[PDB]
Amino acid sequence: MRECISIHVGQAGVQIGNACWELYCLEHGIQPDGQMPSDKTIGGGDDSFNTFFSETGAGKHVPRAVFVDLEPTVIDEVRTGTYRQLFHPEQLITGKEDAANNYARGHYTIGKEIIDLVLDRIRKLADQCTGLQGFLVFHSFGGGTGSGFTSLLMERLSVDYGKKSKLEFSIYPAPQVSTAVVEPYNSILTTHTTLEHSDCAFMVDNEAIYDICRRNLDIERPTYTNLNRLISQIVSSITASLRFDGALNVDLTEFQTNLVPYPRIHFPLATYAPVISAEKAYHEQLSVAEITNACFEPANQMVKCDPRHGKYMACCLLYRGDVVPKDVNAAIATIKTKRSIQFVDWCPTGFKVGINYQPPTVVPGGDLAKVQRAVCMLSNTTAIAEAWARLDHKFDLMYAKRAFVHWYVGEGMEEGEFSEAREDMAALEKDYEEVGVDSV
């Protein structure tokens, strides 16, 4: 049992954290006050769920989590909401003044004022671990805190925990819900500076999620609450191998071995199914083959891009619920005889499969139907580079005129960091090209 610490940074990181930790509580039978009647070992234990929850002598199960934002109003709603008793007040950390959608303020001007306190509180969580496996960092690409402060924190964590593993859940911007013209700048800056401090990063495209809410759940104008409930289901599928045990369970680190062929190639595409409303799930059993096949339809991806037009380097299927290997193997044999799955030539083509038997949960008053089985596919495809190209193009359009650059220079940044970050992104796009060329 190796503990995982979650760090939720900025509004998007915090609000997605709210949705995730509420969902985890429901999945483990933990009440809003942290009591868990089914846990008979009081004040401690080595159970699977203890990777994410520590225990007090009073029977409280406490998330191994820190929430950090440079202004107080989002975290204040945690301090005062349904799950306020779950967290010790020192896990909820706020400044007074946010980063104003400016990476420079998140990484330097405002962030430098709070980083030592944050690392101190993280240290307090790490010291309660007997075998810390690593960190999970949640943040947006687009905000000043989510970009600048997260990059600062990732650098500092590399210094204080060596090469202890760091995974990211990264919210990639969409115009339907974006708040700042400069989000392409912040995105490229944070990607450049975090690239060598991250072991594996799950990008979540707000537009992919928004379209899935509109099309599959018939929500006419999704809010962050809609987006976040769906996101938390995907995050839950990815962490379920850490929080539950079972015979056919396969640890996330074992998928990681397959998902990262070179340190910089560490951005898996996630695809989740089934996403379906109560009204349509009624009397509609969705089988193993149906949800598996749904994994290969690009409308179900969390990042908009087209794997049909790139090459695979790995394909992983994380099943949960009522699923046995014979049905998985049959569905996979079907898909391989009919779909556009081309691997690079230097990679074996077998699909790696994990099954967790605990079935998916839904939050009361959500929009997803409660289903008997779900699957999250994690694949490593060259197509994810499309998401970089789109963002790089927006960056180029503005940077050619130095639009808004004075806001960054005023906070102490230099144009050279802009061009350095943009060159790193151009080299990343080329890396994704090179891995797809055939061997000579």
Partner: protein, 69 residues
Amino acid sequence: KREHEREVIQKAIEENNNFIKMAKEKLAQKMESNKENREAHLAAMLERLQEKDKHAEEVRKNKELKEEA
């Protein structure tokens, strides 16, 4: 073979330490470069405003030397 095993593990230790060290150093140089740049930007803003003040006192004593006629 034992000597090789010792060299492999000490190489791993040395690469992790050099990574920690270079991250530490480049962070500290970035923070200092940035504090200097920001302070220089503010100091130039302030110097412009203080020159405005000197021009205002110049304008007022100009008025008082032409009200001496």
